[PDB]
């Protein structure tokens, strides 16, 4: 057990020198670079890329409160739409991935709004993001989407497919496997390179073999010639 004062961060080290190395790395990781004083505690005076720090930490509240109130299947939608997708994630997996995107600048507020909109969480737009979904639906009408037509197609198919069809989908997927959801099946096929934004033939092959010809035709309408 070793303590760090900036933000009371703690670690478990074999010796004091290792604890200093771990903490000195955490200093760069955050961006803070102050004078070090090492009892079993270490204190850090300067920063780069108080007020600013409070704002940065406060911004995370929006993402933390959003992720905690997201829920099982919405987690997949959000992670799928934000490229880096994890199959059947947990709070610790999602919170970590969303924070890894925010620190990489890949996540923005208007993107997060459309991300929560496509998820169907208009309740979270109203209550947490303070954005009226009646206005947001009008905003997206005359604005180019942050997500690919393929991304939006897979999301639409996911919504129309029922619990029985997705159970049958897993049974048919055993020929290329295992997935627990349709978005999990998509991820497996994307990794195996059978599905993708360019082809989408594999999605229609499954929908034809699930008797959802209406969904197969919907994918064809959403992709064209």
């Amino acid at each position: 057990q070793y303590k760090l004062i900036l933000g009371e961060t703690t670690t478990e080290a074999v010796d004091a020198a290792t604890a200093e190395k771990v903490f000195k790395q955490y200093a760069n990781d955050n961006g803070v670079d102050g004078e070090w004083t090492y009892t079993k505690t270490f204190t850090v005076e300067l920063e780069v890329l108080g007020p600013l720090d409070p704002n940065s930490m406060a911004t995370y509240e929006v993402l933390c409160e959003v992720a905690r109130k997201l829920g099982t299947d919405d987690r997949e939608v959000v992670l799928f739409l934000l490229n880096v997708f994890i199959p059947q994630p947990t709070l610790a997996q999602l919170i970590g991935a969303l924070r890894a995107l925010k620190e990489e600048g890949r996540l923005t507020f208007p993107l997060l709004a459309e991300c929560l909109f496509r998820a169907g969480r208009r309740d979270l737009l109203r209550d947490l993001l303070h954005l009226d979904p009646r206005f947001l639906e009008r905003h997206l009408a005359g604005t180019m989407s942050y997500f690919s037509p393929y991304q939006l197609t897979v999301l639409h198919v996911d919504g129309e497919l029922c619990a029985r069809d997705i159970r049958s989908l897993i049974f048919l997927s055993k020929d290329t496997i295992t997935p627990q959801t349709f978005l999990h099946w998509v991820y497996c096929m994307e990794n195996l390179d059978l599905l993708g934004p360019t082809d989408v033939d594999a999605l229609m092959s499954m929908l034809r073999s699930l008797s959802r010809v209406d969904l197969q035709r919907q994918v064809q309408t959403l992709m064209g010639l």
Binding site: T108, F109, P110, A113, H130, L131, D132, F135, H139, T143
Partner: peptide, 20 residues
Amino acid sequence: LQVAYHXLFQXYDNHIKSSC
């Protein structure tokens, strides 16, 4: 403030959309 919040959101969204 609400209409201004919706205005500000549109300004910020249009700004990232007017980049790439």
